[PDB]
């Protein structure tokens, strides 16, 4: 468990706390989101981010932040702007980047 | 059954032939289309239009045309641009109007 790992795990726990319904916890499936896999080319979610921490796949905060941003951009791309989903993704994108700075 | 009725029934049959899957045949429900009723404030579909023909609620081709437009605009509003539904609604809106000229 390297120092980068405990840094990224703290950031991850604080970002997950901003999504209390767990909308971002797991991979979206086409069954709950028709046509998702044909619109979103590179899916990301907090459960996948946690795995990549433990796989030592992030070597820097910048790489971690890039996956967080991809998760939020995917949500704002797929979901219409008036939805719970879109609003939450915008809200946490900007707050999350502010927190990690 | 008045003369405006056989005119509008002809136009309706010709517009329905442009929708061979029946995507526009019946009212959309929130069960097949999450959030629909909160986003689309005045739903319309070919079944409703046919009923309105029979109720003599159309006194002019222009009123008929307005309900057709409303049907197409609702679909272009609710559905994302990449979907079968949005493309079909755009295609038939402009061709239907050309046809009824």
């Amino acid at each position: 468990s390297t120092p980068i790992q405990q840094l990224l795990e703290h950031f991850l726990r604080q970002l997950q706390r901003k999504d209390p319904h767990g909308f971002f916890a797991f991979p979206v499936t086409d069954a709950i989101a028709p046509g998702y896999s044909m619109i979103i080319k590179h899916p990301m979610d907090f459960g996948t981010m946690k795995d990549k921490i433990v796989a030592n796949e992030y070597k820097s905060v910048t790489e971690f932040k890039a996956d967080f941003k991809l998760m939020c951009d995917n949500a704002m791309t797929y979901n219409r702007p008036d939805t719970v989903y879109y609003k939450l993704a915008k809200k946490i994108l900007h707050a999350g980047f502010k927190m990690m700075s | 059954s008045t003369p405006i009725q056989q005119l509008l029934e002809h136009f309706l049959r010709q517009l329905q032939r442009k929708d061979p899957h029946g995507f526009f045949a019946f009212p959309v429900t929130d069960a097949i289309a999450p959030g629909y009723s909160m986003i689309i404030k005045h739903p319309m579909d070919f079944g409703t239009m046919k009923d309105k023909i029979v109720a003599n609620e159309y006194k002019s081709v222009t009123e008929f045309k307005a309900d057709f437009k409303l049907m197409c605009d609702n679909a272009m509003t609710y559905n994302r641009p990449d979907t079968v539904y949005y493309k079909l609604a755009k295609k038939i809106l402009h061709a239907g109007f050309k046809m009824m000229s």
Binding site: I32, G35, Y36, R80 | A33, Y78
Partner: peptide, 6 residues
């Protein structure tokens, strides 16, 4: 809950 039609 999520998405459009299909």
């Amino acid at each position: 809950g999520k998405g459009g039609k299909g």
